């Protein structure tokens, strides 16, 4: 039986309210081994080892606790067969896209979450447990970076999303589908993601104390400026604008980031638009503004990889070259 | 044969260049279905639509409702669902309005454009289309002007109502109506924009991982009337961003709760004691049509508990 | 505190080999919201249902409709969407019908029936649940027993109105419903079982490259009295079958064209020239949902022109 | 500029009708070469030969067709540099998964089509085309199997399904996503396929006329054990079920495959749900009884791969490690 960590962080999984089938709850509130000793069917596939790393709500996940995470999974690669990591859902789709471009481990690892506090009825949190276990504990989990494991389905990184704001099967991989499904304790993979993660890509943050501040502008009918401007006043080190359509700007935003572009702030275009890739050779002429198109990465999974690109290079064509590979 | 208007304001459908005329003169297949006259009233990129060209094509359509049978309008793609929306609580008019894009311009290969606008004229002609609020006609579907949203950044098939689903598909120049949305829209709602010349200020801000709280304070500094939260999950928000906004709404800012997550409400006794914060929840509004709603609930009331009514109500 | 009776009829939500009393049993909370009497129907996997649990339900429900405030049904998941579509037409009570199921037994890890039948119950127990049809409520969601269809097969979240969406989303015990079905059901029906003791003969052939008419040939040798055709893309034949079920429509035996597509209306006005075939097109009506439609038609009419009528009603 | 190759079978694609606003069409009734001069601007991307092979509605798809396809692509793989098959929607999801597990040509092998006859007002057709090509035209389009192009979205052979009736959208890769979407010409290919296709299968066409029967008989409530017999009685190799749920059948269907299996006759578990796998391991006692679970294989492409996993064995174990595998 192999030997599985799990790094806690808090989030709904290890939430509880006072009813059964009232919705109200508190989160990141139970521990490790609540969780652990909650699933005793664990013994049958694993050897579990639980540590506490904070015990938040995903709402405040944040860069040291990414740096944490990173840090000891490759810390610790070496003593384990693998990860899973208890978080909140809100966040999750980040702190997973983080780890897929930061752990340099090669053994799975594997986060999970709950829409039910522990103490409600049909909670899903104890069977999703059960399953990131499982799948942090087959061998064919390995090579395919991180993973986000929910409703019986094995999902990538990169791609992976909440979808819902109450449903327990929420998350999806919205682009390129999911990589397996889960089913009696197995996993029939049929897909890999091709872009490149974990070991090969050259963010380190090994001897990083803090990350490239990348902030996030909406765009929509009648949008301020203010927002931008005040990422701006401030020296951001980058801003994703989440664009209207295929990434298209409002007037007034466009003028604030393309003043920016030019004095060397990154800017990259990302879409509210839940599906589909924020495109070069549209309505922007990204080369002309000094401006980054996104791809498939929502805004929240942009911010992720201009702060990590922001570790190597300030150079438009170069994290435009990284947002096409990574 | 009904009268039908076309009020155009640019988009891709237009590429937004080309005039209203020139869109009609492309589908001679109207004429068997229709009475088309073109009025133009902006062209632009919807990614620039704003209060303005919102205030306008409501007072027009308002002012018009008794000198034609049915309205469509061309739009932009990108942010046609909040025009949408807000003429869906403006509009007083009993005749349909049919709001209509396009994906591709005309000169694409397969250019979605045409039969969009055949489909758009063959509903707002369409007898049942009536009292059903306003609308939008996308790939051979009907879909009311609440819940419908752009799901893909290139799709021909990207608009959907992705929370409670379309109201009719069309085929062969008919459709099934088999629903018809039940929140209350157009002369069911209290909103007058009549005699209005802007609207209050209302922004959204983002919500994520370590988020800042730069943009929430810059609009508090600039005095917005309302300041909508692109929450996490369940309408979550980044400590520094929450308490930012817990001090704008008890310092004369309205402040609604929604989601940056693509589909389900941000609901009441979740994680967030609403009541205490001051806050208003958005339910199924995703944050730009929240921000319509809220522009509008601030013409009547700054009142929180009564914001919350009408957001349950609308 | 309502009276709802849930009439159980077995499913994985009773894995069916749990009697109705230990299900009540084991959801102490139903007594917050309602005065639950259980009645075991039949305990079966609803992989073995049949026409005459169908016409117990009905004569059940209608028979009883008096004696209590609404209803629940423990059923399998498989055909839940047959039942409920049956049921959906045959009902003659004003009050709620919730149907509901669990993908999970109750002694596997993370099961959803405990929360499935507190929902149902919530759903049952709710005034605004009233005249919108028989419903099935699961993974939080009230869906109408027309456009319901079972999606995937393991996930809890299966169950969708994959063509018009659900009515409403339950969240802390209550329900925002926002649509109602339009097309007609229960009381607005002629369909009335309650003296017969078995239905018209249906059968439903698959379509497929190179299908064999086999199977068609087989149930027109049984004398079936309607064939529901599984139709590739928009209900189209394979050529051996199309030949097989055009002698039948002529030859005594009604032929409804359906798709074997997830989505989507098998339509008039395509590549089959139904008047000329004597066939009916099943709109949004699946393989199974015709099925019902038909057996129910065909104890009213053999007239394929009346029985299309009622598939552009019901 | 590659030189491309297309295979015209029929379908809408190549169908028209007397209104452009109208539905009513007939279908597979223009040749490839109007098709091809119906879109000039292939020019820009191929040196394109058409070929027709049949002019059919793909409602009327059959082995022998199939068969044609097969070898001519398998003959002609050394004259171009990739294959268009301009086909019907309504079987378009069986050709191409025949294709995926017969084709040995290690070229590039796009199937199209269309939802709207090329008459009709924003007909779908020219694009698609222009898009087929594209696709065949990729270096990196190679090596993934057979492909359906339809809507910008290149897909895989084997999950590709239609998803409704109408939709100039309707083609999905169902439980495991897309493959790449093509945008401006240009595909961002982030997945390929796992199962194993093409040259790594052992089915071997080239010398067959004909294919082992296989039939697929429907479950539902009160279901008919007529048809399961007559396709016994006819002696066919083997049956599908279309099951319902996890692949569950009707009590007199069962009855009667499971005596046909114990007869020697191949019987595969499917499901008429759309998505999700039928699996082992739940209701049925696959062993047992010597039934197949088809996994995420749908009826008719279950079908196509029992007719030729029958090609190679008729031991169920053995038929059951095929479904596993391809
Ligand atoms: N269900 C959850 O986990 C939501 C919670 N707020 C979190 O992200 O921590
Ligand atoms: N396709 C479109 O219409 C997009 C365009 N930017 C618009 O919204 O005006
Ligand atoms: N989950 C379930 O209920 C499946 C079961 N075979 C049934 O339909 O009875
Ligand atoms: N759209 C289409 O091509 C449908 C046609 N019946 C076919 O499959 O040939």
Same mark, same amino acid.
């Given at each position: 039986?192999?030997?599985?960590?799990?790094?806690?962080?808090?989030?709904?999984?290890?939430?509880?309210?006072?009813?059964?089938?009232?919705?109200?709850?508190?989160?990141?509130?139970? *521990?490790?081994? /609540? %969780?652990? +000793? !909650? $699933?005793?069917?664990?013994? @049958?596939? &694993?050897?579990?080892?639980?540590?506490?790393? #904070?015990?938040?709500?995903?709402?405040?996940?944040?860069?040291?606790?990414?740096?944490?995470?990173?840090?000891?999974?490759?810390?610790?690669?070496?003593?384990?067969?693998?990860?899973?990591?208890?978080?909140?859902?809100?966040?999750?789709?980040?702190?997973?896209?983080?780890?897929?471009?930061?752990?340099?481990?090669?053994?799975?690892?594997?986060?999970?979450?709950?829409?039910?506090?522990?103490?409600?009825?049909?909670?899903? *949190?104890?069977? /999703? %447990?059960? +399953? !990131? $276990?499982?799948?942090?504990? @087959?061998? &064919?989990?390995?090579?395919?970076?991180?993973? #986000?494991?929910?409703?019986?389905?094995?999902?990538?990184?990169?791609?992976?999303?909440?979808?819902?704001?109450?449903?327990?099967?929420?998350?999806?991989?919205?682009?390129?589908?999911?990589?397996?499904?889960?089913?009696?304790?197995?996993?029939?993979?049929?897909?890999?993601?091709?872009?490149?993660?974990?070991?090969?890509?050259?963010?380190?943050?090994?001897?990083?104390?803090?990350?490239?501040?990348?902030?996030?502008?909406?765009?929509?009918? /009648?949008?301020?400026?203010?927002?931008?401007?005040?990422?701006?006043? &401030?020296?951001?080190?980058?801003?994703?604008?989440?664009?209207?359509?295929?990434?298209?700007?409002?007037?007034?935003?466009?003028?604030?980031?393309?003043?920016?572009?030019?004095?060397?702030?990154?800017?990259?275009?990302?879409?509210?638009?839940?599906?589909?890739?924020?495109?070069?050779?549209?309505?922007?002429?990204?080369?002309?503004?000094?401006?980054?198109?996104?791809?498939?990465?929502?805004?929240?999974?942009?911010?992720?990889?201009?702060?990590?690109?922001?570790?190597?290079?300030?150079?438009?064509?170069?994290?435009?070259?990284?947002?096409?590979?990574?």
């Amino acid at each position: 039986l192999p030997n599985i960590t799990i790094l806690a962080t808090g989030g709904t999984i290890a939430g509880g309210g006072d009813s059964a089938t009232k919705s109200n709850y508190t989160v990141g509130k139970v *521990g490790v081994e /609540n %969780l652990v +000793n !909650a $699933v005793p069917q664990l013994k @049958d596939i &694993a050897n579990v080892k639980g540590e506490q790393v #904070v015990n938040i709500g995903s709402q405040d996940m944040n860069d040291n606790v990414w740096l944490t995470l990173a840090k000891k999974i490759n810390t610790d690669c070496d003593k384990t067969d693998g990860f899973v990591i208890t978080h909140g859902v809100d966040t999750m789709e980040e702190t997973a896209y983080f780890l897929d471009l930061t752990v340099k481990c090669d053994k799975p690892v594997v986060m999970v979450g709950a829409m039910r506090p522990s103490t409600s009825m049909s909670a899903d *949190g104890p069977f /999703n %447990l059960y +399953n !990131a $276990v499982v799948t942090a504990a @087959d061998k &064919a989990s390995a090579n395919r970076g991180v993973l #986000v494991v929910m409703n019986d389905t094995v999902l990538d990184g990169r791609d992976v999303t909440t979808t819902n704001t109450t449903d327990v099967a929420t998350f999806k991989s919205v682009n390129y589908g999911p990589l397996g499904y889960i089913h009696n304790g197995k996993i029939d993979y049929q897909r890999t993601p091709a872009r490149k993660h974990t070991s090969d890509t050259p963010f380190d943050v090994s001897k990083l104390n803090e990350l490239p501040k990348v902030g996030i502008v909406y765009n929509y009918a /009648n949008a301020s400026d203010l927002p931008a401007k005040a990422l701006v006043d &401030a020296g951001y080190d980058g801003i994703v604008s989440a664009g209207v359509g295929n990434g298209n700007l409002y007037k007034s935003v466009f003028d604030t980031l393309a003043t920016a572009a030019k004095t060397g702030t990154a800017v990259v275009r990302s879409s509210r638009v839940p599906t589909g890739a924020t495109t070069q050779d549209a309505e922007v002429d990204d080369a002309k503004y000094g401006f980054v198109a996104s791809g498939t990465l929502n805004p929240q999974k942009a911010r992720v990889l201009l702060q990590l690109a922001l570790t190597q290079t300030k150079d438009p064509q170069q994290i435009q070259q990284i947002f096409n590979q990574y």
